[PDB]
Amino acid sequence: AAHHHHHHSSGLVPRGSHMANKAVNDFILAMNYDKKKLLTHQGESIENRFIKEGNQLPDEFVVIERKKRSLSTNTSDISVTATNDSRLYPGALLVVDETLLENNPTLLAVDRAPMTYSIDLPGLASSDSFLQVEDPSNSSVRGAVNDLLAKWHQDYGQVNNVPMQYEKITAHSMEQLKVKFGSDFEKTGNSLDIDFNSVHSGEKQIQIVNFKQIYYTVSVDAVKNPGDVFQDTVTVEDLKQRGISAERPLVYISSVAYGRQVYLKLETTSKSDEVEAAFEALIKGVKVAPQTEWKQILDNTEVKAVILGGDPSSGARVVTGKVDMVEDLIQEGSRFTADHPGLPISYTTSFLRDNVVATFQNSTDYVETKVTAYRNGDLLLDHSGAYVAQYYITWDELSYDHQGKEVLTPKAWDRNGQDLTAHFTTSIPLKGNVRNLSVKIRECTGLAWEWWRTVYEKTDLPLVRKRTISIWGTTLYPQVEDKVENAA
Numbered sequence: 001a002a003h004h005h006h007h008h009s010s011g012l013v014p015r016g017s018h019m020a021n022k023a024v025n026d027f028i029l030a031m032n033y034d035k036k037k038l039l040t041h042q043g044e045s046i047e048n049r050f051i052k053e054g055n056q057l058p059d060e061f062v063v064i065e066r067k068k069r070s071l072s073t074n075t076s077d078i079s080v081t082a083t084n085d086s087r088l089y090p091g092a093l094l095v096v097d098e099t100l101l102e103n104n105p106t107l108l109a110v111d112r113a114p115m116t117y118s119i120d121l122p123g124l125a126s127s128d129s130f131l132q133v134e135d136p137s138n139s140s141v142r143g144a145v146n147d148l149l150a151k152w153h154q155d156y157g158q159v160n161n162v163p164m165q166y167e168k169i170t171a172h173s174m175e176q177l178k179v180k181f182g183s184d185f186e187k188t189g190n191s192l193d194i195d196f197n198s199v200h201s202g203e204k205q206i207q208i209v210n211f212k213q214i215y216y217t218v219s220v221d222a223v224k225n226p227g228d229v230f231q232d233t234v235t236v237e238d239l240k241q242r243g244i245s246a247e248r249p250l251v252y253i254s255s256v257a258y259g260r261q262v263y264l265k266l267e268t269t270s271k272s273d274e275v276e277a278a279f280e281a282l283i284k285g286v287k288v289a290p291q292t293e294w295k296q297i298l299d300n301t302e303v304k305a306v307i308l309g310g311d312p313s314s315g316a317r318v319v320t321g322k323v324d325m326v327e328d329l330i331q332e333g334s335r336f337t338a339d340h341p342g343l344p345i346s347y348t349t350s351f352l353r354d355n356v357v358a359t360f361q362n363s364t365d366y367v368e369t370k371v372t373a374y375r376n377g378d379l380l381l382d383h384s385g386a387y388v389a390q391y392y393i394t395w396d397e398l399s400y401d402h403q404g405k406e407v408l409t410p411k412a413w414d415r416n417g418q419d420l421t422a423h424f425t426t427s428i429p430l431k432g433n434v435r436n437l438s439v440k441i442r443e444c445t446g447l448a449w450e451w452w453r454t455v456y457e458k459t460d461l462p463l464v465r466k467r468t469i470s471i472w473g474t475t476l477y478p479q480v481e482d483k484v485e486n487a488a
Contacts, residue, residue, distance in 0.1 A: 025227030031246040043364020051404035061432025063372040072363035079182040086138040103184035111231035153338035171206035173366035192265040202371030211262035215336040219255040222355040250352040257346040260309035260333035268301040271373035374432030382470040383424035392440040437461040
């Protein structure tokens with residue numbers, strides 16, 4: 001007796017019956033899977049073997065120290081890069097597999113039961129926040145939301161000045177960026193034209209800034225029973241036909257954030273350690289003095305950006321140029337108006353089975369490259385004395401061997417020890433290479449009991465941009481000037 005109740009004598013479960021929805025509900029509840037393992041991905045996992053490198057650039061000598069780092073993110077927020085993604089609407093059903101991890105999700109588009117949404121809008125009434133969509137799709141949900149928006153803007157609603165939020169990192173690897181911003185980021189990074197090669201060779205430094213402006217978010221309350229999102233026309237076999245199982249379970253978009261997003265690239269050829277500070281000052285719109293080190297950095301900074309939402313169409317703009325246009329990028333989407341509903345920039349998913357928020361674990365190993373720059377310099381000599389003079393100029397040229405060991409190669413001015421006469425001038429180019437610079441200058445007095453007189457003798461001379469050593473005067477009273485020009 002107990003076997004037959006709530007069942008058809010045919011033994012079949014009729015399509016469009018309450019029995020069908022019940023079977024679907026039990027079918028999803030019966031699923032046993034590991035939530036974390038299904039949403040976990042590993043990046044590269046590099047090994048810690050690195051040697052110190054030295055390289056000569058046209059204007060400077062760089063010392064590069066490579067190091068393996070680890071970046072691991074564990075978030076439920078999924079960044080949106082697609083423009084008009086029909087799949088990414090509130091309450092949409094997504095399949096849990098590789099495609100969900102890659103942010104190119106598989107939409108489960110079956111007959112949907114009505115769903116109730118709430119929207120958090122600054123200056124929106126309590127019970128006017130709810131929306132009842134009878135047949136959830138991208139269109140029906142988008143329409144219901146925009147209808148509420150249009151009403152909310154035309155009725156009243158202050159032009160809410162939207163807060164700007166941003167997170168930033170120093171670029172190193174494309175994989176590392178993907179862990180930080182999402183695995184769909186590769187499209188954006190290619191638009192930003194990030195020069196990873198020049199970073200690794202220490203020729204330039206990159207910082208990536210992600211701006212977010214959330215106008216509003218649409219949310220879905222917890223689903224009581226897994227089968228409550230399906231119409232009775234949906235059967236268990238229908239789900240299996242589309243490959244739904246405990247191994248490929250279901251998830252629903254529990255909320256979507258709407259507004260404007262900006263991925264910013266700050267590309268500087270500087271090797272300074274004040275780069276992060278200079279970039280920050282730029283973002284804050286802080287005035288920069290011309291003779292500062294920051295101004296040197298910012299003048300040599302190329303800026304590219306991808307705009308998602310705000311201003312014109314929904315389409316993504318790829319603006320390019322100098323530092324001057326960063327300020328307007330930030331101010332552009334400051335106000336949320338009737339002109340633009342705003343578009344999805346972020347969404348979150350919850351498992352259909354138990355409404356637990358789906359959290360994605362991503363990690364990767366990357367090489368953190370440090371670069372230390374030593375500027376080239378020139379050593380200038382001027383001989384305007386009434387005497388024969390000799391120079392003894394000597395230095396070491398620094399290099400690094402294939403084992404990263406430090407190497408000092410002795411060097412000497414080819415005209416050392418030679419008798420030089422006024423008016424003699426010369427310029428000796430010295431690379432950042434140079435350590436332990438020593439200059440000795442002596443003069444022939446003509447006196448039999450003391451033929452030579454030292455006019456100048458310094459060791460460990462700093463490699464400034466321009467050092468001019470000028471000698472003049474007489475055999476008995478020689479004069480010397482050690483003039484340094486190293487101002488920025």
